[PDB]
Write a protein that binds this ligand. Structure first.
Ligand SMILES: O=c1ccn([C@H]2C[C@H](O)[C@@H](COP(=O)(O)OP(=O)(O)OP(=O)(O)O)O2)c(=O)[nH]1
Ligand SMILES: [Mg+2]
Ligand SMILES: [Mg+2]
Length: 325
């Protein structure tokens, strides 16, 4: 349909959809962390931090950090077996404490993934993940927030894509999904950077030691133009990734303004046969580069097939105003 049709249908679909009771949750989690180790920092990261708002059905993501992890706010998270084991060890303790403190809460320690994470479900509002000893999660969010503070209405695009990604099952937060919401944010941001809607922010200007464990909220003004800018952006975004972005040669990347190629990173077929993250192949089919991690494809789970599925969903998205019509 037209941008006008698209944009209006999206705004319509957003009625029930700020940072209300994340304080209360952050404090419940801080309670448990203090019991493990009173000197440990707790940080919020994830959509609450990225958007400056909390959306319906979004969990809350926390990370547990040592002071020296913070004060060294420009140094990478190590890949290694030991780092991964250290995180699971600290997470195992905290999970113990949470279950003691919250008999109603399911607290699950998830190992499959690259990053050790504890998933907590307590019905209703209680929905949160906790990770440990990793500043790139907070540094990635703060980068994404830096960009969204530049042009706050771009969050509407990112949010529209995020919901869609979940409806269609592309999102890794759904069973079968393969790209996390974070990956879709990088696309939206890379996309907007390409269209000159955002101004480049060198990842290296983001200091973790300066980030607020719980940043302030960012007022979310509903679209005044009946939604026409949004529909224009949704349409243009889907276009960009079907017909402009070349996935065979290009890397969705925030590390430099302009174009990044796969050859430049050695993100090639030869690299697939040498890799195996969590015992499995990494794929360089749909390339999305993590700004702070070493050599990490946020699209390592996008098989040649899922790349086809994605491309198919992108077409259908164009024809249905992101499945709103
Ligand atoms: O592979 C990842 C995924 C997430 N993050 C960090 C940066 C990201 O901005 C934040 C949270 O992203 P997530 O994909 O967990 O989604 P969300 O932003 O919390 O959205 P929602 O919770 O609505 O799915 O965690 C990473 O560094 N690497
Ligand atoms: Mg979240
Ligand atoms: Mg999460």
């Amino acid at each position: 349909p037209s941008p006008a049709v698209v944009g209006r249908s999206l705004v319509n679909s957003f009625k029930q959809f700020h940072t209300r009771h994340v304080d209360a949750t952050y404090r419940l989690v801080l309670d448990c962390v203090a019991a493990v180790d009173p000197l440990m920092r707790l940080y919020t990261f994830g959509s609450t931090v990225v958007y400056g708002v909390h959306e319906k059905g979004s969990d809350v993501d926390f990370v547990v950090l040592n002071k020296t992890d913070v004060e060294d706010g420009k140094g990478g998270d190590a890949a290694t077996q030991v780092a991964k084991g250290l995180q699971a060890d600290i997470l195992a303790k905290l999970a113990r404490v949470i279950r003691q403190k919250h008999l109603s809460w399911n607290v699950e320690e998830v190992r499959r993934t690259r990053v050790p994470v504890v998933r907590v479900k307590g019905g209703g509002a209680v929905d949160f993940d906790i990770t440990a000893y990793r500043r790139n999660g907070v540094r990635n969010s703060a980068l994404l927030r830096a960009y969204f503070e530049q042009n706050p209405p771009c969050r509407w695009l990112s949010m529209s894509i995020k919901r869609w990604s979940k409806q269609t099952g592309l999102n890794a937060s759904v069973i079968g999904g393969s790209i996390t919401s974070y990956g879709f944010n990088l696309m939206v941001v890379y996309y907007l950077l390409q269209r000159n809607h955002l101004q480049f922010v060198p990842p290296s200007t983001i200091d973790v030691s300066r980030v607020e464990p719980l940043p302030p909220h960012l007022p979310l003004e509903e679209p005044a133009d009946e939604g026409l800018e949004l529909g224009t952006q949704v349409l243009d975004f889907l276009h960009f990734f079907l017909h402009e972005f070349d996935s065979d040669k290009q890397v969705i990347s925030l590390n430099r303004p302009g174009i990044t190629t796969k050859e430049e990173l050695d993100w090639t077929k030869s690299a697939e046969d040498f890799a195996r993250m969590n015992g499995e192949k990494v794929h360089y089919q749909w390339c999305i580069e993590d700004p702070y991690e070493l050599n990490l494809n946020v699209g390592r789970n996008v098989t040649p097939l899922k790349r086809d599925f994605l491309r198919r969903h992108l077409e259908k998205a164009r024809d249905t105003a992101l499945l709103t019509i």
